[PDB]
Amino acid sequence: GCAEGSCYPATGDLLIGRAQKLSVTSTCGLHKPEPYCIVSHLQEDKKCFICDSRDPYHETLNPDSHLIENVVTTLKIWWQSENGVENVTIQLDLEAEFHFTHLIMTFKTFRPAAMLIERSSDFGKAWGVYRYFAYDCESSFPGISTGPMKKVDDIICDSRYSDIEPSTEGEVIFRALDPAFKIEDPYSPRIQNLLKITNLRIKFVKLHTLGDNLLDSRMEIREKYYYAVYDMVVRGNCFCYGHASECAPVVEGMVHGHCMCRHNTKGLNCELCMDFYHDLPWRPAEGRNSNACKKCNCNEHSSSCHFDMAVFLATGNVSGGVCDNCQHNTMGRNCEQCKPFYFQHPERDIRDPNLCEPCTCDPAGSENGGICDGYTDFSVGLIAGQCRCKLHVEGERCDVCKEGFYDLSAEDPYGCKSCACNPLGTIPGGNPCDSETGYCYCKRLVTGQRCDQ
Ligand SMILES: *[C@@H]1O[C@H](CO[C@H]2O[C@@H](C)[C@@H](O)[C@@H](O)[C@@H]2O)[C@@H](O[C@@H]2O[C@H](CO)[C@@H](O[C@@H]3O[C@H](CO)[C@@H](O)[C@H](O[C@H]4O[C@H](CO)[C@@H](O)[C@H](O)[C@@H]4O)[C@@H]3O)[C@H](O)[C@H]2NC(C)=O)[C@H](O)[C@H]1NC(C)=O
Ligand SMILES: *[C@@H]1O[C@H](CO)[C@@H](O)[C@H](O)[C@H]1NC(C)=O
User: Fold this and answer.
1) Residues near ligand 2 (Cβ within 6 A)
2) Terminal Cα distance for the chain, rounded
3) Nearest ligand to residue 26 Cα
């Protein structure tokens, strides 16, 4: 179970439950009845019938309809192209984004003379070519390679499925991950650009005529050459990087496309980290390792955080979440400090909403605009609150002139100005002057500010 490590949804047939998503290029009997023939082994004999494909097949009402929706299995139904048409294309459209195992088509007539398979990850915008197939990889597909594959993603031209010999029920097969390889790293960029699929597309380009030149011929010669397909399975699954055990609707036997993520992951494919769980870098599960996204810690002064790789490494791959918009005047990568002009109450829990107290330093007399010590830490000379008074100021809040000085003006570096009280004419003992006026207390028979005159 996911509650024990990595986990993945079941595999299945993508076509099931998705019949109405199939679209063709040619289909005998769409508008008005067309006839056809079933040649045998080397043209021994031929029996012909009619193709009335203008109404959904039914065994006892309309037995000659052969629309593409007839490939999705669950008797003998099928799809069939127009007689003598050599350019037919089938297309599957997925609502979500799935992983592709393998495709298995079984024709009723004679497997294509030559065909190729394409796909799209970016919803029918860009198209990649999985592989080519032919009986003459050189005439039909000049340039494309044959022989062996130099890489697990080499586009080549197969031919083991483009014969004739198998009269009917012949099969075409394609596997995303060429069995002839060892998938070293699963989640790698290339092994991924092989399974990623939203749109499958099969293009037929050559019909086996057994000699006859369909080129301007009697409806008697072409009426026997056409692609017909009994059914086809598109094996695959809904990918969730190990973080989900089952996918939900975006029925029966149907492969769903919405990952029911777990492990604090969120996303259509759980490739993201649930909100506020950005303390470790997102990773896919493996073995019993969930690699579950880790909850951020902002000491309860936020709930918006993001993951920063630099920080992650800086801590030795321990943690990399940094908090956003620290509330309560806190600060720090985890909101574990107080912004200037505030200081941590010596008591209070670091999680307390009021952990941070405002300074009380009088800006004019203090040093550093009146920023107090933010927290206590003897070893360095830090006390929660303590203000740094200027040279000639004193008091818990630095709002007082030291004896002998006056005029606490913020406008100056040291705060107060020396009274400059003459030692002679000034009454000795206690404060020699007014802290405001700067007027010294003079002896008798002496006068004037500085008790000099
Ligand atoms: C702390 O974690 C970081 C983050 O990345 C890892 O995070 C963990 C949680 C998992 O998610 C894990 O899968 C992530 O990789 C680590 O930093 C990264 O470490 C990987 C190690 O594989 C680095 O990848 C390598 O990069 C070099 C240089 O670009 C490549 O050469 C390697 O690929 C080939 O190297 C030679 C080629 O001749 C041959 O051995 C093979 O051909 C190799 O395939 C390989 O890709 C990646 O660059 C690192 N990225 C960062 C973040 O700088 C980090 O190591 C870890 N610290 C610790 C605990 O040591
Ligand atoms: C079929 O493909 C040929 C080239 O191979 C092209 O000339 C022709 O126009 C195509 N016919 C279709 C599908 O309209």
Assistant:
1) 87, 205
2) 98
3) 2
Exposure string over 55-68, b if 16+ CB within 10 A, otherwise e: eebeeeeeebbbbb
Cβ-in-10-Å burial (0-12, 13-18, 19+) of 93 comes to middle
Buried b (16+ CB within 10 A) or exposed e, 231-263: bbbbbbbbbbbbbbbbbeeeeeeebbbbbbbbb
Contact indicator for 228, 212 with CB cutoff of 8 Å: no
Q: How was this structure determined?
A: X-ray
Cα(55) to centroid(ligand 1), Å = 58
Number of domains in the chain: 3
Pairing assessment for the beta strands 128-134 and 157-158 based on DSSP bridges:
parallel
Regarding whether 156 and 89 lie in a shared domain, the answer is yes
Q: Cα Rg for the chain, rounded, in angstroms? A: 42
Cα–Cα dist 159/172, whole Å: 10
Same domain, yes or no: 161 and 301: no
48 and 175 both lie in a single domain? yes
CB of residue 119 inside a 6 A radius of ligand 1: no
Buried-state track 430-452, b at ≥16 Cβ within 10 A, e below 16:
eebbebeebbbbbeeebeebbbb
Resolution in A: 3.1
Domain span at residue 442 reads: 351-453
Ligand with an atom nearest the CA of residue 187: 1
